[PDB]
Ligand binder design. Structure first.
Ligand SMILES: Nc1ncnc2c1ncn2[C@@H]1O[C@H](CSCC[C@H](N)C(=O)O)[C@@H](O)[C@H]1O
Ligand SMILES: Nc1ncnc2c1ncn2[C@@H]1O[C@H](CSCC[C@H](N)C(=O)O)[C@@H](O)[C@H]1O
Ligand SMILES: [Mg+2]
Ligand SMILES: [Mg+2]
Lengths: 190, 204, 207, 62, 55, 204
RNA sequence: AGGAAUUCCCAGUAAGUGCGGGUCAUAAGCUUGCGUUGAUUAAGUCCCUGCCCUUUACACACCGCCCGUCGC
């Protein structure tokens, strides 16, 4: 049998174009699940949350933002609606869209600060792949939340357009702006 | 597209003499400044006052493309509504801050909208994300043309110090520029930053 | 405005046109739209990108009727009240074919197989072939008022035309002769056919 | 300057002085058999792959 | 440079063990890079003769 | 070539309260001003304050390329030296004005050279030969681009109203122009006027 | 939708929700149990603020003397 997310999105066609992030995005055949709700212990040990599927991580990180915490089913349906809207608008596999968005949104180098009372200075430093994934997911969720606030537009459409723009690589998205400015500051502090 | 102006190091603080509360001025409060070993010549609300008059009456604010932030010396951030009408004369101006600094907000008399509001630090959180952040100072040897630095369709942040002496130094700015070969006041600095912007953005 | 059939607010809004817009349709691929408005211009938009791909300005009156070919996304036809039906098609910056009609063109329809274009102006209904450009194969009038709309049945042979005289005419494409008539209470502004001939819907002058 | 890829061979320790970044030894995925020392922000273990915009800068230099 | 300076230290015969322990650690960690560079060929030839001879 | 600006309708005068001599300020003198029924709000000295600060601080003036004249409502004509420093604080500004009207002039603190001195009416006599006069106001339907009105090597006289309400109208002005479609302050009109003439004459 | 400053917090933990009891002390707009839903980041250094100790079981291997003052 073939395991398809929500019964209709396959995972075999999904491919990752970044060799560095191959080991930290769990979307392939072993990590394929029917629903993003598995009730595992992925925060028990260091580096174990790399085994949690990326859709479940997106569901968890969408619960923290702009919501009373502990409501997971609402977030699952929000993710389902966002995937449906993405498929309707773009016509391709939403899993590939999400993977491309996470690949594009992740910063490559950051700036470590040495700070005193008077002034702060920086040095450009490398970023580990796990922090790349964490910041990508966090930026996408925060951008969707900020776009959805005080607007006649439900969170699902804002999340869908955020993933669409990030996967396209357009600068109209929040995460791309944040990533570009972080790399620009890191370049300036070399 | 918009211009963000942040007034760094504004000398806005409240002191009490007798039974009355009024903002701390170098001249009216000369005796109490000498008390407690405070150096005279930093209580200058006028620098913020003259600088504010230039921004709020500028054509860019008239067209609705100017937003002004004030960061005082006591690390208090104030948001300036473009629809606010600032006092032109010095005395009633100080009443606004005494109204603002204790009550933390100022409501419009003829409108439900707030006009002045104190918000959470740091100021870097409230800028549109991805905006360019540039400061103004004489310490730069190279004189830069303001028109060349203006973005076509993006917001940009310009920081002007509100002190007669000292150097602007905040964490979020990425470059330091000078735009004249002569030392000029903060108020005129407000003028030359804004007056270049309308002509690029087609406001005449 | 793009709308979801299960939502409440538009998913995408396009701001390019300046005056009222009256015709809009998809393409052969389901991700671009072609629109025509009263500012004498016809614009092609991309749905996911949320921007206008291309524009055309080659008409002199109100543009209120348009159709897009199902076979090819590139090929589509635009008609107007300027008495000209210009086909904006292929991948270029100008009309490749144009057609002249003696009355303002209310509606245009593209016959799927064989490249036949049917145009309605006033009483006249005119059929044009694309094997030879701008060839009026047959011009027919069976109405005593302006012809409003033209529809195609599920079968290729049957064709329907509705007008302002409470009367809908059914023709065979092979013979180009009337084979049936329908009579109604008010002038038929809209004529719609379901799968096969399951449901016939006629929308009138009144509510 | 083309984008470079590196593999983490040995994790040295936490700087302390330079924030809390980690000095690691990285060897380039090209068949040049080179190895340098870099500063990494965030959790990193042996076997990780890093993306370098600049392959010339060294962590410990005069 | 340090490989050249180490060659002088072994020849003098003073503090051989500390230099040898230091020398063998550099060769292993940079084994891949040292082979590629043709400029280092003369240095290793002098190091090869001196190291075994002194020990 | 040199820019001459005359401040017309300036509200500068000294009044007697108690035994001391004080400048007639609107806010300070509400009790006195209401008596005799002359209109409150007309006495607006501060308009002269920031106007001088903008003009004197402009790079053109420190270049030696600016002249400022003051023609008050009480028909007093005042010269100002380019080397004069105008106080930033308003009451120190009112301090110097008081000693002008009574002592007719003021010497520098470190030299006998004249910084302020009241001269004889009219202002037209002291104008240099071959100079044409232009007026500035908002009411003009057509807006004039300031870059077009600058002469290459001719001195120039402009009039800016330092009064509260009304319109400038003096005999020696030959033409009347507008610089923007918005109601502007005299300080900003002085700000824009000095800004445009700066680049044309090679001052940066 | 609550400034300046300041307090607390690492896994069924933070946060939301309901349902009981008043138990020889404490508890009434309070106090304590029970269950349901359940997260983001971190698994390491002495850089700041500090705390606790030390500087006299001879396998192999490694290593090879902390300093100063005043009293008797
Ligand atoms: N030529 C110039 N270009 C840009 N900013 C200037 C400027 N001259 C003065 N400023 C700004 O105006 C403010 C007050 S002028 C204060 C002088 C101070 N030595 C200084 O130049 O920093 C300062 O904060 C300064 O940043
Ligand atoms: N748009 C403008 N262009 C040129 N001068 C202006 C101006 N707006 C105001 N001024 C000058 O500024 C001074 C004060 S404004 C005085 C009020 C008058 N209704 C007016 O709008 O001008 C006047 O003396 C006037 O000459
Ligand atoms: Mg709160
Ligand atoms: Mg409870």
């Amino acid at each position: 049998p073939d395991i398809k997310l929500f019964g209709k999105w396959s995972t075999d066609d999904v491919q990752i174009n970044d060799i560095s992030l191959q080991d930290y995005i769990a979307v392939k055949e072993k990590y394929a699940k029917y629903l993003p709700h598995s009730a595992g212990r992925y925060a028990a040990k260091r580096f174990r949350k790399a085994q949690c599927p990326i859709v479940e991580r997106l569901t968890n990180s969408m619960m923290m933002h702009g919501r009373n915490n502990g409501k997971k089913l609402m977030t699952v349906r929000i993710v389902k609606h966002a995937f449906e809207i993405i498929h309707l608008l773009t016509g391709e596999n939403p899993l590939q869209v999400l993977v491309n968005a996470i690949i594009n949104s992740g910063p490559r180098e950051d700036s470590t600060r040495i700070g005193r009372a008077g002034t702060v200075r920086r040095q450009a430093v490398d970023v580990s792949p796990l922090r790349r994934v964490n910041q990508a997911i966090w930026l996408l969720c925060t951008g969707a939340r900020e776009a959805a606030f005080r607007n006649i537009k439900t969170i699902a459409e804002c999340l869908a357009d955020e993933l669409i723009n990030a996967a396209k690589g357009s600068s109209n998205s929040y995460a791309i702006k944040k990533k570009d400015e972080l790399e620009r500051v890191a370049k300036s502090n070399r | 597209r918009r211009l963000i102006v942040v007034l760094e190091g504004a000398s806005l603080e409240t002191v009490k003499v007798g039974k009355t509360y009024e903002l701390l001025n170098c001249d009216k409060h000369k005796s109490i400044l000498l008390k407690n070993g405070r150096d005279p010549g930093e209580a200058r609300p006028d620098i913020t006052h003259q600088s504010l008059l230039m921004l709020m009456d500028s054509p860019l604010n008239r067209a609705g493309l100017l937003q002004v932030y004030i960061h005082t010396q006591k690390n208090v951030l104030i948001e300036v509504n473009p629809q606010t009408r600032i006092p032109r004369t010095f005395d009633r101006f100080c009443g606004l801050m005494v109204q603002l600094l204790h009550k933390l907000s100022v409501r419009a008399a003829d409108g439900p909208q707030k006009l002045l509001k104190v918000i959470k630090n740091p100021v870097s959180d409230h800028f549109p994300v991805g905006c360019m952040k540039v400061g103004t100072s004489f310490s730069i040897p190279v004189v830069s043309d303001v028109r060349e630095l203006v973005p076509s369709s993006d917001p940009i942040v310009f920081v002007v110090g509100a002190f007669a002496h000292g150097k602007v130094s905040v964490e979020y700015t990425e470059k330091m520029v000078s735009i004249s070969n002569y030392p000029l006041s903060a108020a005129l600095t407000c003028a030359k930053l804004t007056t270049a912007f309308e002509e690029v953005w087609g406001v005449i | 405005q793009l709308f979801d059939i299960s939502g409440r607010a538009p998913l995408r809004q396009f701001e390019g046109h300046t005056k009222a817009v009256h015709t809009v349709d998809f393409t052969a691929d389901k991700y671009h739209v072609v629109s025509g408005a009263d500012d004498y211009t016809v614009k092609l938009w991309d749905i996911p990108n949320s921007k206008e791909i291309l524009t055309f300005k080659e008409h002199s009156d109100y543009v209120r009727c348009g159709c897009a070919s199902k076979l090819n996304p590139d090929l589509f036809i635009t008609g107007s009240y300027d008495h000209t039906v210009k086909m904006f098609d292929a991948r270029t910056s100008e009309s490749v074919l144009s057609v002249e009609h003696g009355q303002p063109v209310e509606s245009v329809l593209l016959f799927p197989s064989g490249g036949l274009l049917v145009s309605a102006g006033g009483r006249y209904v005119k059929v044009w072939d694309m094997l030879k450009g701008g060839q009026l194969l047959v011009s027919l009038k069976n109405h005593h008022k302006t012809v409003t709309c033209l529809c195609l049945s599920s079968s290729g042979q049957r064709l329907l035309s509705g007008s302002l005289d409470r009367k809908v005419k059914v023709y065979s494409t092979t013979s180009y002769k009337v084979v049936h008539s329908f009579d109604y209470a008010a002038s038929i502004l809209s004529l719609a056919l379901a799968h096969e001939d399951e449901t016939i819907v006629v929308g009138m002058t009144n509510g | 300057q083309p984008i470079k890829l590196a593999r983490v061979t040995k994790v040295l320790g936490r700087t302390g002085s330079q924030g809390q970044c980690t000095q690691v030894r990285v060897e380039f995925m090209d068949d040049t058999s080179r190895s340098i020392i870099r500063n990494v922000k965030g959790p990193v273990r042996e076997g990780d792959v890093l993306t370098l915009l600049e392959s010339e800068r060294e962590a410990r230099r005069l | 440079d340090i490989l050249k300076l180490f060659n002088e230290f072994i020849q003098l015969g003073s503090d051989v063990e500390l230099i040898c322990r230091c020398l063998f650690f550099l060769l292993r960690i940079h084994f891949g890079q040292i082979t590629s560079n043709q400029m280092l060929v003369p240095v290793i030839e002098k190091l090869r003769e001196t190291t075994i001879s002194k020990v």
